[model samples]
Target chain A: KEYKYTVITGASSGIGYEAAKAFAKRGKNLIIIARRREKLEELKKEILHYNRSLKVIVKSIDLSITSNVYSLYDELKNYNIETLVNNAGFGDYSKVNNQNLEKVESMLSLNIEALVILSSLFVRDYEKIEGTQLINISSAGGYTIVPNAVIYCATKFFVSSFTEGLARELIEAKSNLKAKVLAPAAQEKFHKYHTSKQMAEFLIKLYDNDYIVGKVDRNSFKFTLQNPIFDYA
Target chain B: YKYTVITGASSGIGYEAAKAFAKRGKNLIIIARRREKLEELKKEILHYNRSLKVIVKSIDLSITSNVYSLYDELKNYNIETLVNNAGFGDYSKVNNQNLEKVESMLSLNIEALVILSSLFVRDYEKIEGTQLINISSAGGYTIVPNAVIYCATKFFVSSFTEGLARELIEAKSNLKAKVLAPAQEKFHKYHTSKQMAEFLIKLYDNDYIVGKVDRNSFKFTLQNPIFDYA
Candidate 1:
């Protein structure tokens, strides 16, 4: 049997970086993608340190570009990719008028467009494949609108709704593939309360669960798995 | 000399909204991809209100460059209101959805709307009586079966518009940002195009209400801040 691999985008830092280690500990081979080659290389070495048999591939490419999204999937066609973790996203916390339009465009391209393209491609290829999963990283901002980060929250809202709907569609079609969203409320400052390592472990728990959504409680910071949050028609 | 600009005025709610605004003696700048339909709309508007000035622009907003250029081209006009209504929906499963169509949808529904709203707010936030209205859908509040991406885009619109409204309030800006989310079934059954236009006029007249149609009743309700604020 061909070896199946889990592909995680934005795997160089924070939750993505720690998640690589968590998956490697579970004896899963990985394909890690981010713009920083040095950090990806460092992550690869660290993953290899504990598990010598695991194949930790590093792809350094900017996902903010529209063309790179499709090219990344095409380049990985040879590999038996089973799970696609769309975890590469960023936010700019500023009022709409004060925000730079160019930067906002880049954020939309990465946060919304890149995730849609990758998830669509992955679903097209692996919908019938047993054990395939598509995990999208959204935010608590996806559910509630924050004051300054309006557009960023909008992008996350798109992520949460899109992934939830896709999961429902999969269920309706009786497809074997599972799609899920993980929406964490923590930011850089909140990392003091709960480390990225802990969040990465939560990611693994989400991966292991059968639930469609794993969201962090806004007040208590506890992660809980549940059915789709938004009302479905 | 102030103007009300409506995008996607070639058909549907935009087309009717233009007539409703014209009925109130408002000058109009109607934009859409179909030049003929826009011309027809302009003729209809002028027929109703001969004193009102009607300008028609035929441009596809799905192109990012076109969205920016549209704003640049409108610099000569004293725009008081902007209605971002240029969006479409696709009904299909995610696996079967067209990537090209999805890209275009995202460009128009999210990218075009954001750019226009940003530019309008930057220029008009200080000006009194200026408003930005984004057309969302019932899907904005509730995820629909077969139209996941479309629902997501509307969710983006609803959430973004509400958040921007709060930001404007915090900054003490005069410009009003509101979202209009109409449920499709009730919208079609309860009102004709003219009736819908009248409803839009009622929405336009009221300064305090953000627009949404109740999911169960399909009755339009105007309220402030449709989503929970963080």
Candidate 2:
């Protein structure tokens, strides 16, 4: 909580866990959160094992519950948060009619509502601090016409457009706020499917170093412009 | 192809859209739900310029079963261009509104528009020099609370425009694809009016460079936006 910059909403695995690893390399203090306590600790040990000087604080909450995200933001207000990665998201990838409706609500809570909530909370408190970068981890699959992923696409597309609209508003408001949306498909699952601990650690190491400066490293960065190639707004 | 086909052409924006093309000397193959209006508009446009062409086909575009037949007719008439302007809108909260209304909007605004664009694009690409222009709205720019589903429908419009533009680029087609997203056109036929004509003209002349809405526009942003009444 005493860190000058905290990239949040992912500290256990996937991009969030990797981002934790990346920030440790840059020597930024961390305030990582997820629903699982064990996952947070395991990742924290990995981060510290690499950099003994690294500092990471873990908070456990199931953000898929909409109210928990707001409470998490309330807790985050004390830190000098310069960067917020609203990467806490889940997907059902089901048909529009037969789909589990709760999955949509959960994702809306995390992907759409939590994203906007965290961004506002950060931006409101951002001006008092010096640094500001809100990198939202969206998906490239948002552009697909497949009906199975329709609602998931809906949520991501909403964020992409919302980001564009808000980006302008911040500029107009004269607030020193900037946002980056990493719409990666492959890089997201790198840690999940890895067979080698060495490879995972290396990927882990790459992320730990890159995030302290407010971006993932080149080797870890996977963004393709093939989706949504034209104008967004 | 001898004709440029436009859907929803008997009334409202589609009818005026027909005139927009007719002035350009393209023969019109226009559709409307009301047969009487379709025939009347056909005569009306034909009277405007005797040299021009006007073909009328009246059918509800929401009926997906009719889409293929519509395509067949277009192909028969040698439809070189399709202006997919057939759409309807209702301002209601998403939670409280009729589910059937949602389905209807999805059918016409989202589903039908998408299907028509795909068919037209596939057909147009086969020909050496063909063009298609879609009619999306400025509403596609931001999420509006009252027009929740309507906003989603327009987002698809924006998405499809982006998607098809890339498809044309990859194919390296000279067949230019453009989408015109005016804010609100004040056409002659109307059951009611929102008087967004000034907004539409501003968007037409400035906001979108043909079809790109300005990200910085005031209507696109809010600290909190709710679309439940959609």
Candidate 2: docking tier: incorrect
DockQ of each candidate's interface versus the true one? 0.86, 0.04
Question: lDDT scores for all predictions?
Answer: 0.89, 0.60
For candidate 2, the C-alpha RMSD (Å) to the true structure equals 12.5
List each model's interface RMSD. 0.8, 12.2
Query: Where does model 1 exceed 4 Å of error?
Result: A187-192, B184-191
Predicted model with the maximum TM-score: 1
lDDT of 2 by residue, B1-230 (tens): 38878787877667776776676678988886898998887787788888887887888888766766788777777766677878888785332456456556756876577567666666666565466666666667555445545665676565555545544655576554556555454643322112222232233333222443334452421111111100
| Candidate 1 accuracy as TM-score | 0.96
Identify the leading candidate in terms of lDDT.
Answer: 1
Which candidate leads in DockQ?
A: 1
Candidate 2 residue-wise lDDT at B158: 59
